[PDB]
Amino acid sequence: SALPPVYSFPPLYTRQPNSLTRRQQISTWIDIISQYCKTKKIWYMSVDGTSKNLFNNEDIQRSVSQVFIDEIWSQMTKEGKCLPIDQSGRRSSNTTTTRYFILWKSLDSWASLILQWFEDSGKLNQVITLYELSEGDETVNWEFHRMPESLLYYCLKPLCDRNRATMLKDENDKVIAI
Amino acid sequence: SALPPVYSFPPLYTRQPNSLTRRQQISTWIDIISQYCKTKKIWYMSVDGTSKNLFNNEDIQRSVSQVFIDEIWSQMTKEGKCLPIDQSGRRSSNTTTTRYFILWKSLDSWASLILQWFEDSGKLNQVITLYELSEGDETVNWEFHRMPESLLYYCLKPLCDRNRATMLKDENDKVIAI
Amino acid sequence: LDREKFLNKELFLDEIAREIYEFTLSEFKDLNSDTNYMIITLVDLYAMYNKSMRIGTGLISPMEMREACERFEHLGLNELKLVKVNKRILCVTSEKFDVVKEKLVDLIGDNPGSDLLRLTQILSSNNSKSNWTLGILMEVLQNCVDEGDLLIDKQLSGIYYYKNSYWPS
Amino acid sequence: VNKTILEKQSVELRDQLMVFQERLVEFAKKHNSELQASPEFRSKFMHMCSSIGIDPLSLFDRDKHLFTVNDFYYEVCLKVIEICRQTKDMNGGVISFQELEKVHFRKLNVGLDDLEKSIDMLKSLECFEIFQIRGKKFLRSVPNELTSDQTKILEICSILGYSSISLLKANLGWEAVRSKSALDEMVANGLLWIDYQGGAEALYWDPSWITRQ
């Protein structure tokens, strides 16, 4: 669970003055984030946390300095495990960074499961929407279920190297074919 | 000239741990105490430090450690160059050890360079007090000038063993019969 | 290509010694130009030796590794030796201990004000001829320091390194 | 007139043991797996060999098939060699046997006694060292001895997990300079984690306070 023990080791919550530890501190943090969003099937997350904070819903002790969360956040993305968003999967970093998409699995990977949705079945010729391979009745042991359209796109897009599959845009939406 | 350069060397402020280096360092951390007071004309130094600090003060980087100081101090003690006090020379490791009177020349290299005040002045017999030989019209091209009385008491306490020229006590303070 | 299924013990060693000596050499001299070396802490040239060249061949115990490694000399394997350094450093190396300490100092010297991590980067992420692997790096750093060959600058941050060019022994 | 009435018992005694062993090898020779996938059985099968005085790890030799009880022993050695490294920073080059036991070693089911020997095994690589804080064994990845002091701080941490500037004066009569001073090196050396969120006084922690299990 989002109960990794250390999650309550007081010092975690304060940037360590020790270089090699400072490091571990972060990486550990990154590691926590991750598994909470997995297990408790979370998707996106702020700089607060999704109600409750990962950086302080541990108010039942203390909480991480924002200045840090940031530094963490970064190195959490530079590593490519968290994704910066706002309302649309992109950056510029301000009016364009508030929530974050989180990757249990990679991207160029996370499609290979969507795709292998179709592969494992065959309905690949077909055309279906995002609000479908999601929220509908294709919520089997495909941990991409309930996943948000707005991100969903992001994962499909890799389902197109030079050798693709393809979307059904709109100057207002999207949905796909394989 | 109180900025030798070593004084700007980070590893000077950490208690190097190699016995034989621990020292040699120390010694240098000394000829900084020493000459600093000299060319910059100071007399007594604290531990904390004289607001300026030969140690902590080191502000464009970061400071020494008390334990080291104290250690630094002691080995200067023994080699005889600094001396402990609260207001009063003699000691008692706590209260009566809390200020050090540096020491360009020895303690008595100090006494003797006073009877030299009497070698080219023709004032060998009189009876002068400290407020004298130190301040006023005694801030001659003779360096013990401005030298606070208390150490004087001490620079002079040895003369009382050679020519044997005593001093004038009132409640046990001073002025002397050279 | 044989499993730990020989019969007269001090062979498997003799031999096992041989296998290692190669696993080790197979990890550096390759370079066109020869000036490189590999100093290496036993314990590591151990999870390396096994995890690598010996998961199926027959995994071995430490005592063995040691026993083995201690043989090189005798077997006319003269490109590496095992050696206690000070009385704490245990390693098989390719040069005199000192002449490696030297190369460190000297380099630390060049980039002074060094963090382990940095000392690492110079020594590892710049590919160029290094077999420095953490531990033995780590271990040697501590000699210099004790031997007083290096001046420490211990900060709450971590320990920064410099060349004891001032208080010589 | 007494000298041989015992020098005699020797020769057969030798047997009795030479027996008990070629014996021991079989009780083992049989449980080729009751030994390979089961701690408790491991331990018991040794606390015997030791009494008699026979290194188990060796019994596991007279017949090829016993050579995997050792593999496991060796195997676990490497895990230790590794868990130690993969941790050098979280902790400091010092580790609670607990953690080793009740944390990193569930993945392969090995147990205190097991681990323990493995660690002894290693003494051959001549690299780790064991030390105990209040009767809790720790293994030390790094080169430096914790101090004669540092121990204490570490020792005096066992209570609630965090020696402090006061907690030290107070509970130990440890001065107060010869405290922060001594406490911070413990952070530069990265053995305990600092913590500003909890009072005017800074709190210093034990990575291990964490695995109290």
Swiss-Prot record, chains A, B:
Question: Keywords in UniProt for this one?
Answer: Cytoplasm, Endosome, Membrane, Protein transport, Transport
The record's annotation in Pfam families points to:
ESCRT-II
User: What topology does it adopt in the membrane?
Assistant: Peripheral membrane protein
Task: State the InterPro entries in the record.
Answer: ESCRT-II_cplx_Vps25-sub, ESCRT-II_cplx_Vps25-sub_N, WH-like_DNA-bd_sf, WH_DNA-bd_sf
GO cellular component terms attached to this protein's record = cytosol; ESCRT II complex
Q: Which GO terms describe its molecular function?
A: protein homodimerization activity; structural molecule activity
What is this protein's record name? Vacuolar protein-sorting-associated protein 25
UniProtKB/Swiss-Prot annotation, chain C:
Where mainly found?
cytoplasm
| Cystine connections | none
> Which molecular-function annotations from GO does this UniProt entry contain?
phosphatidylinositol-3-phosphate binding; ubiquitin binding; zinc ion binding
An example GO BP is:
protein targeting to vacuole
Q: Provide the coiled-coil residue spans.
A: none
Q: Which domain of life is it from?
A: Eukaryota
Give a Gene Ontology cellular component term annotated to this protein. Answer: ESCRT II complex
> Where's it found, cell-wise?
Cytoplasm; Endosome membrane
Is Signal found in the keyword set?
no
Which UniProt key words apply to this protein? Cytoplasm, Endosome, Membrane, Metal-binding, Protein transport, Repeat, Transport, Zinc, Zinc-finger
Other comment? Present with 2470 molecules/cell in log phase SD medium.
Family the UniProt entry places it in: Belongs to the VPS36 family.
The record describes the protein's role as:
Component of the ESCRT-II complex, which is required for multivesicular body (MVB) formation and sorting of endosomal cargo proteins into MVBs. The MVB pathway mediates delivery of transmembrane proteins into the lumen of the lysosome for degradation. The ESCRT-II complex is probably involved in the recruitment of the ESCRT-III complex. Involved in the trafficking of the plasma membrane ATPase. Its ability to bind ubiquitin plays a central role in endosomal sorting of ubiquitinated cargo proteins by the ESCRT complexes.
Entry comment, domain topic: The second RanBP2-type zinc-finger is functional and binds ubiquitin.
Subunit note: Component of the endosomal sorting required for transport complex II (ESCRT-II), which consists of 2 copies of VPS25, 1 copy of SNF8, and 1 copy of VPS36. The ESCRT-II complex interacts directly with the VPS20 subunit of the ESCRT-III complex. Binds ubiquitin.
Protein name (record):
Vacuolar protein-sorting-associated protein 36
| Organism annotation | Saccharomyces cerevisiae (strain ATCC 204508 / S288c)
Q: Name the gene.
A: VPS36
Section of the entire sequence shown: 396 to 564 of 566
Swiss-Prot record, chain D:
Any Pfam family matching the protein? EAP30
Topologically, how does it sit relative to the membrane? Peripheral membrane protein
Q: Which residues form a coiled coil?
A: 4-27
According to the lineage, what is the superkingdom? Eukaryota
**GO molecular function terms attached to this record:** lipid binding
Keywords from the UniProt entry: Coiled coil, Cytoplasm, Endosome, Membrane, Protein transport, Transport
Record keyword Nuclease present:
no
Quote a single Gene Ontology cellular component term: ESCRT II complex
Per the entry, what this protein does is: Component of the endosomal sorting complex required for transport II (ESCRT-II), which is required for multivesicular body (MVB) formation and sorting of endosomal cargo proteins into MVBs. The MVB pathway mediates delivery of transmembrane proteins into the lumen of the lysosome for degradation. The ESCRT-II complex is probably involved in the recruitment of the ESCRT-III complex.
The remark listed among the other comments is: Present with 1040 molecules/cell in log phase SD medium.
Query: Oligomeric state and partners?
Result: Component of the endosomal sorting complex required for transport II (ESCRT-II), which consists of 2 copies of VPS25, 1 copy of SNF8, and 1 copy of VPS36. The ESCRT-II complex interacts directly with the VPS20 subunit of the ESCRT-III complex.
* Protein's name in the database: Vacuolar-sorting protein SNF8
